[PDB]
Structure formats: structure tokens, C-alpha cells
Amino acid sequence: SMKCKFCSREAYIKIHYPKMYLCEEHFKEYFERKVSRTIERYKLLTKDERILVAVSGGKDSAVTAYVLKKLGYNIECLHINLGISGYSEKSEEYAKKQCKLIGAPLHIVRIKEILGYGIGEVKTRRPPCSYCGLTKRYIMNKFAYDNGFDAIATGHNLDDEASFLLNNILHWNTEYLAKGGPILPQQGKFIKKVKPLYEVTEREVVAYALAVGLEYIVEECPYATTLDMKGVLNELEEKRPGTKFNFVRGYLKKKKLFEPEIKIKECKICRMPSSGDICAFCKFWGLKKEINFKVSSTDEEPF
Amino acid sequence: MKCKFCSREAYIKIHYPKMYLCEEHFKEYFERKVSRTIERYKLLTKDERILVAVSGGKDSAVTAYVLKKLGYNIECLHINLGISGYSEKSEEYAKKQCKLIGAPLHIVRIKEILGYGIGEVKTRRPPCSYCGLTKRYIMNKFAYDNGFDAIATGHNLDDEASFLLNNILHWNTEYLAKGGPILPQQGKFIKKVKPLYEVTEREVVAYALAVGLEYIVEECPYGATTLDMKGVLNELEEKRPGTKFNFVRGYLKKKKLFEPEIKEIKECKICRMPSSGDICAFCKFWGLKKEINFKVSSTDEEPF
Ligand code: SF4
Ligand code: SF4
Ligand SMILES: [Zn+2]
Ligand SMILES: [Zn+2]
Ligand SMILES: [Zn+2]
Ligand SMILES: [Zn+2]
């Protein structure tokens, strides 16, 4: 029903804030420039850096890898196959597809193969959601550490951070609120984690994926409070535009207030940053040996 | 359904904790819940002169009704904002409420003591901004001049949760530093309490209906952000019950974290009330040269 603000081509998307109608080609350029600005603003990455993009098969990580590669970054991708039968199989396939289109090396880690059982197979009263996050985070860091990557880039966008903030404020998880934001610096054996999509919304991600022809898993894991928070914040954004941004940017200014609400050791098994004698990952899976994630070359590209 | 304690038919269902109560059992429960809030946060004693700031709305009406039923030494104050077509019936609803409650009502008319009502001032500033400042001053000055020990407001759980949610979204750390059910006596500032702090609006609406309390449902003409936050929190309460309470109680524990975000106090050159500069915010705004004396010998309805 409209036309592009910079050309005679028909409008593809309307940016709710700031108001402007852009076509496919102009939206891509805008979205890419918005990401580059997020990198520049928070000093996330340099061009002389080995980056590991944690791809899951979803839209978020797919676009992160695509944009970073288009912006000329030294990226490689990692897929952690959780081993959820009927889910994780096509999830691995979507990532292979995504990385082939992107033109980036893809490394695959299969939980069922290295640990024994997949997520939702462990004889535990603990929900799969609780230990899945802990398992994904460990393999992400250990893989990047063992292969000497400078940084880890996740798919987490503005909607993801706002819903994370809203949930944590409601439950007053001050320790989690203390360590949030677009960058988590290199501290010990913990690799620097960045969020290049921190300032963009899910609608801009969905639209970007569609335009660049990126296929992803829309369906979410069978084992959620996240979708509740996101809908609540979308309702608020309708009435008052800019809410999500002003809330997230405001949080970054006041993030210093939660510092006294947060407190160290090295694991006896994997030597990774632990709280006690043995780390949370090693204690859970009952591991006696260290998983070595060092690889000479990818599955698709050996030698 | 039927009542959990008698053969009488259910009047209301408490979403958390789950129980069906009749009119007579709900009143008793609601009253006990308020008494517990008083006891828990050490809000009031029986040997205290209390001023309930009644507005004509459900909140302040119930606060006065419950406190009087719990045997407290209450007197009520109505601040008539002078909003033509609104403030007139608002004053009438309070007169009605206090007559039912059986409490002395003191009326202060803005248009009469200041000159112009709220929304009549030649200012680009919205009426909502200076109305709150004006209500707060008269509330404190009246309680101070008549030597009341405390001020009790109608603010309930939904009011606090929406206040918290809005202030967190705008990261107003200074406002978040000084929240909660009690604001103690500091200088010429009178102790402010919230006896309805733990009860929800649905429990207030139901209590008013049961005790036969008529109030103004309609809100002031001067879009309000409060109704947005409340609807958002009601949506959250549906899916996850107890959310509002766990969020408010959790805030009280972490309230200490916003203390470094609030930094000497002065006395006004005109009214001698707690000021930031030479002249206070109230006196500077209305351009007052003289001090308004709120000391009264006896009420409008009960003179001599
Ligand atoms: S939603 Fe699924 S993938 Fe995400 S943390 Fe939970 S179990 Fe793991
Ligand atoms: S909503 Fe009306 S009564 Fe309430 S503070 Fe604003 S102007 Fe005053
Ligand atoms: Zn265009
Ligand atoms: Zn370990
Ligand atoms: Zn009953
Ligand atoms: Zn003054």
C-alpha cells in the first residue's frame, strides 16, 4: 500500500520507530548498518578477530552469522545437537542449509554422541529447559576456548533482552540483572560473548531472513514464560513506541546498581571456571574425563 | 458454588489462595488481611490520630471503612480539586462515604483557597503533574497543622505493582528508592501508611459492594499510563497467579539497592514546610506570598 523512501520500488516493511517505508534491498542495507552501529557503539568486535557464531537453526543465530559474514567478519559456526528425537534432527539440517547459503564453516557437536543421552532423556525431576541452557553454554565456551576463538556471537535480539529483563525484574533475580547487556568480556577461561542483534527487534529479524532467503525453525522446543513476557512488551510497544529500547538502554545505565548482589575456582575434571571443586556441567553429567573440542577441520571441509 | 465456612452461596473466589467465600465471610477475611498488613509492617497503633485522605473513589473509601471497623481514631480529608463536572460529585460521594462510615469529614476547596481549580492554570504543564504535588502538600499541611499522627492512603497491591512496573520501565531509581507501605515521620513530613497494600482492586471492588459503599468509578479527564500497566499485570496474573505479590514483596527486599540513587534539606521561606531551595515547589508554583493555615476548630457537618 506504499512505496520506498529512497527508490521507486514498492514498500516491503514499515519501521514502527523511526517511521519509514523501505523495500527489500533498502531494508537489508538499513538492518546491516544498524548491526554495524551496534558493533561500533558497544565496541563488540574488530575485523582481526576469529568469531564463533552459535547457530541453532532458528532465525536469530542464522541472521547473526549472515550479517557478520556480509559485514566481512572472520566467522565460523557451531551447532550443538541437543538430541531431541523428531526436533534436533531437522534443527541440525536447517543449520547445515543456513551455513551453506552464508558460506561459513560449520562445526557440529552431538550431545547423545559425546555425553550419552540427549536433552529430555536424563532421569531427573529437573526440567530439560534448566540443564539444556547450562549444557549449551558450556559446549559453546569450551569449543571456542579449545579452538582459540576470540569471541562468541549469539542470536539474542532486543525482544529477547527486554523479555529477559522483564522476567528477571518480576522475580527480582538481581544476580542475573547484574551480568546482562550486549557484551560479556573475556574473564579467565570464559570467552568474550557478544550480541550483534542487541538493538534490532524480532520483526526486523523475521523480515531480514525472508528477504535474504533464510529458512529456519519457527517451532520452539517441546520442553514457556518467554512468550508471555514478549506478548506483554509487544502490547506496551503498540500504545507507547520505543518502550523496549528506552527500557533496555535505561537498564544499561542502571546495571551498576546490581553489582553488590554478585559475590573463583577451576574444575577438578575439565579445568574450566568452577564455583566449587567440580563445575556445574561436570557435576551434573557425572564426568570423570575432560571433553576435548579441538578440531583440525570441519565435517564438510576436512584436510 | 458455596462458601467454604457456611451453607451460604459463594460471593467471590480468591484466585490465590483458592477459596470460595460469601459476603459475610469475605468481609471478615478482607478485614483480617488489612489488620495483618498493619501488624506486619508496624503501620499504626490504636493510640494514634489518623487522617484518611478520601477522594470519593473506592480505595480511600474502603481504607476509612476498614480502619474505623478495626477501631481506629480516624478523621477524613477531602481535597476538592475544582474540576467542573467532576470534583462536584466527587465531594458528594465522600460526604456520603463518611456519613456511612461515621467519621468526621474535612473539606478543602482548591478554587476557594488558591483561586483556580486543576486544569484552569495558564500552564503548558499537564494538570496531572501539578495535581499530585498539590494533593500531597494539602494532605501533609492539614495533618501537620491539626497534629495528626499519620496519613492513610487508598493505594492497593495493583496500584503499587503498576507504580513499580512503570518506574522500572523508565528506570526512575530515585522513585523506586522511596516506595513501599510506610514512609516514616521525617521533619515536617507526616508518616504516610498504606493499609490496603496487600489487597487487590477486585477485593476492594467486592468489599465496597458488600458493605454498600458508593464511589466514583470514572477517572479524571486529564491517555493514562497506569491503566496500561494494570492490564499488563492482570494478564500476567491470569497465567501465573501470585505474580503481583511476589514482585511487590521481592521489591521490598531489594529496595536497598536504589538508596545510592537518592542524595541537604531546607525549610520554605513562605510556609516553612520542607523545601529543596529557598521557596518550596508548592509555594513557587502557585506564587504564594502568605502561608495557608489548615488548623480547624471543628468540621463543616459538626461545628461548635
Ligand atoms: S527451550 Fe528448548 S532449546 Fe531452549 S533452553 Fe529450553 S530445552 Fe533448551
Ligand atoms: S488523574 Fe486527575 S485526580 Fe489523579 S493526579 Fe491526575 S489530574 Fe489529579
Ligand atoms: Zn527502496
Ligand atoms: Zn568441569
Ligand atoms: Zn460463608
Ligand atoms: Zn512553601
Curated annotation (Swiss-Prot), chain B:
SS bonds (residue pairs): 128-220
SUPFAM superfamilies: Adenine nucleotide alpha hydrolases-like
Keywords: 4Fe-4S, ATP-binding, Disulfide bond, Iron, Iron-sulfur, Magnesium, Metal-binding, Nucleotide-binding, RNA-binding, Transferase, tRNA processing, tRNA-binding, Zinc
Cofactor note: Binds 1 [4Fe-4S] cluster per subunit. The cluster is chelated by three Cys residues, the fourth Fe with a free coordination site may bind a small ligand, such as exogenous sulfide, thus acting as a sulfur carrier.
Cofactor: [4Fe-4S] cluster; Mg(2+)
Iron-sulfur among keywords: yes
Residues that, per the record, bind Zn(2+) 2: 268, 271, 280, 283
Residue ranges the record marks as coiled coil: none
Broad EC category: transferase
Catalytic activity: 5-methyluridine(54) in tRNA + hydrogen sulfide + ATP = 5-methyl-2-thiouridine(54) in tRNA + AMP + diphosphate
Binding site for Zn(2+) 1: 3, 6, 22, 25
GO cellular component, one term: cytosolic tRNA wobble base thiouridylase complex
Binding site for [4Fe-4S] cluster: 128, 131, 220
Residues that coordinate or bind ATP: 53, 79, 135, 154
Gene Ontology biological-process entries: tRNA wobble position uridine thiolation
Pathway named in the protein's UniProt entry: tRNA modification
Pfam families reported in the protein's UniProt record: ATP_bind_3, TtuA_LIM_N
GO-annotated molecular function: 4 iron, 4 sulfur cluster binding; ATP binding; metal ion binding; transferase activity; tRNA binding
Subunit architecture: Homodimer.
Protein family (similarity comment): Belongs to the TtcA family. TtuA subfamily.
Note: In TtuA from T.thermophilus, the sulfur inserted into the nucleoside comes from the C-terminal thiocarboxylate of TtuB, but there is no TtuB ortholog in P.horikoshii. Free sulfide has been shown to be present at relatively high concentrations within thermophilic archaea, and may be the sulfur source in vivo.
Reported function: Catalyzes the ATP-dependent 2-thiolation of 5-methyluridine residue at position 54 in the T loop of tRNAs, leading to 5-methyl-2-thiouridine (m(5)s(2)U or s(2)T). This modification allows thermal stabilization of tRNAs in thermophilic microorganisms, and is required for cell growth at high temperatures. Can use free sulfide as sulfur source in vitro, which may be also the sulfur source in vivo.
Name the record gives this protein: tRNA-5-methyluridine(54) 2-sulfurtransferase
